[PDB]
Write a structure and sequence with these properties.
This protein is of the alpha/beta class. The protein has three domains: 192 residues, 3-Layer(aba) Sandwich (Rossmann fold), CATH 3.40.50.300; 160 residues, Rossmann fold (3-Layer(aba) Sandwich), CATH 3.40.50; 99 residues, no CATH class. The chain is 28% helix and 18% strand. A six-stranded parallel β-sheet has the order 1-6-5-2-4-3, with helices on both faces. A six-stranded parallel β-sheet has the order 7-14-11-8-10-9, with helices on both faces. The chain has a two-stranded antiparallel sheet with strand order 12-13. The radius of gyration is 23 Å and the shape is globular. The chain binds one RNA strand through helix 3, strand 12 and strand 13. Homodimer; Homohexamer when secreted. Interacts with envelope protein E.
RNA sequence: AGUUG
């Protein structure tokens, strides 16, 4: 057994056998990170099992290092600094890092035990990883453990917690504001706010400060310098993307949650193209995980969860289901077998196994595009499967008249590397590379040939 | 749009 806080000295050998997938369904704040994860690793080390620990974000990656600090782990994430000898039999990294390395042809370790945390992560690389991991188990070469408070099929947005939570439905400002929302500022406790956009996050954060509030901003850009500020520093507000949706222990008093986001959607309707639909409600899983950031401390029983509107369970129009098969179809077991999606995530969309399998030269270009070009999974596949070399930027211009990209109501021109003036007009449309102005700047850099 | 290297 164990006291509150220390890991259990007893661990089921049940979970370490090959051909055995395990789903740990514990509710938020039950201590899968602070208690369970250490003892899984401690026992895995004892059994000398080559172990992989996958985290969805650098936030979860950080909260792991605290629990596992001192153990002989190799941390392969820019979120942790470790002194590693190189003889560790345990590797820690992010979901997408592992999918990346599977795709990047250099070979990866034959892990005996694979513990994925937050196994509900809807990221296309993450979904692909579960496909690989489930397949590795099914063939009997590995033991896997899928930890998540919101497993596939979870729909309750208000699950059990260490402390009572006051659920409150109030209208929430998507933008800056100046009067009507007095309850926001008047709250004399900490608050974690979940904004959809980094920008929507700064028009809010730079409005909260006007009322003399200390506001930390958290996202992929500012994680390294602002996340440790959350912990040992006292603050008023934390405005965050859903980089903190899972894992983060903020020790706050309230969660504000508009429950909205944009989502990539593949259109079958006409020529195929990707849009940025929304703003639309998040999923039952997400809302529960934003809510989970509070109500964790049993000594603090007046935590609040202000939210807005119902979540939407239906996410089949989302492109990450198609993009996940696109990634997974280009991954192989040593034994040759094509990895099939984790069973629970099977048939989220029309799929034929191997529909997206590429050949030779194409596969590397597809991987190359996602890495060297920062292009989305969909856009990369479409371009690569057309038999296009990675450096061949001709396709950024030979699209039809409707594929002309506009910026500030004017047709985008691109001065190329050899110096021609050609109109930006991609053969395939993906809104993710031209919606946000800075995303379009990158795409203008790409089509120039400066990427 | 987020996220990961």
């Amino acid at each position: 057994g164990s006291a509150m806080g220390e890991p259990d000295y007893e661990v089921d050998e049940d979970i370490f056998r090959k051909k055995r997938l395990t789903i740990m369904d514990l509710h938020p704040g039950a201590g899968k990170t602070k208690r369970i994860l250490p003892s899984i690793v401690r026992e895995a080390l004892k059994r000398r099992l080559r172990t992989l620990i996958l985290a969805p974000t650098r936030v979860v990656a950080a909260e792991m290092e605290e629990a596992l600090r001192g153990l002989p782990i190799r941390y392969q994430t820019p979120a942790v600094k470790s002194d590693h000898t190189g003889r560790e039999i345990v590797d820690l990294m992010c979901h997408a890092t592992f999918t990346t390395r599977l795709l990047s042809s250099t070979r990866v370790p034959n892990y005996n035990l694979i513990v994925m945390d937050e196994a509900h992560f809807t990221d296309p690389c993450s979904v692909a990883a579960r496909g690989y991991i489930s397949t590795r188990v099914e063939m009997g070469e590995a033991a896997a453990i899928f930890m998540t408070a919101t497993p596939p099929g979870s729909i309750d947005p208000f699950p059990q917690s260490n402390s009572p939570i006051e659920d409150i439905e109030r209208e929430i400002p998507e933008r800056s504001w100046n009067t009507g929302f007095d309850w926001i500022t008047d709250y004399q406790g900490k608050t974690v706010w979940f904004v959809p956009s980094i920008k929507a996050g700064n028009d809010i954060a730079n409005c909260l400060r006007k009322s003399g509030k200390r506001v930390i901003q958290l996202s992929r850009k500012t994680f390294d310098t602002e996340y440790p500020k959350t912990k040992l520093t006292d603050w008023d507000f934390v405005v965050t993307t859903d980089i903190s949706e899972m894992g983060a222990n903020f020790r706050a008093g309230r969660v504000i949650d508009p429950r909205r986001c944009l989502k990539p959607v593949i259109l079958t309707d006409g020529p195929e193209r990707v849009i940025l639909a929304g703003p639309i409600p998040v999923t039952p899983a997400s809302a529960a995980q934003r809510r989970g950031r509070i109500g964790r401390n049993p000594a603090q029983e007046d935590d609040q969860y202000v939210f807005s509107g119902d979540p939407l369970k239906n996410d089949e129009d989302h492109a990450h289901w198609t993009e996940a098969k696109m990634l997974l179809d280009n991954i192989y077991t040593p034994e040759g077998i094509i990895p099939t999606l984790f069973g629970p995530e099977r048939e989220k969309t029309q799929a034929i196994d191997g529909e997206f399998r590429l050949r030779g030269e194409q596969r590397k270009t597809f991987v190359e595009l996602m890495r060297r070009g920062d292009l989305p999974v969909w856009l990369s596949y479409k371009v690569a499967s057309a038999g296009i070399s990675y450096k061949d930027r001709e396709w950024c211009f030979t699209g039809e008249r409707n594929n002309q990209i506009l910026e500030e109501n004017m047709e985008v021109e691109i001065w190329t590397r050899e110096g021609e003036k050609k109109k930006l007009r991609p053969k395939w449309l993906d809104a993710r590379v031209y919606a946000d102005p800075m995303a379009l700047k990158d795409f203008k850099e790409f089509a120039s040939g400066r990427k």
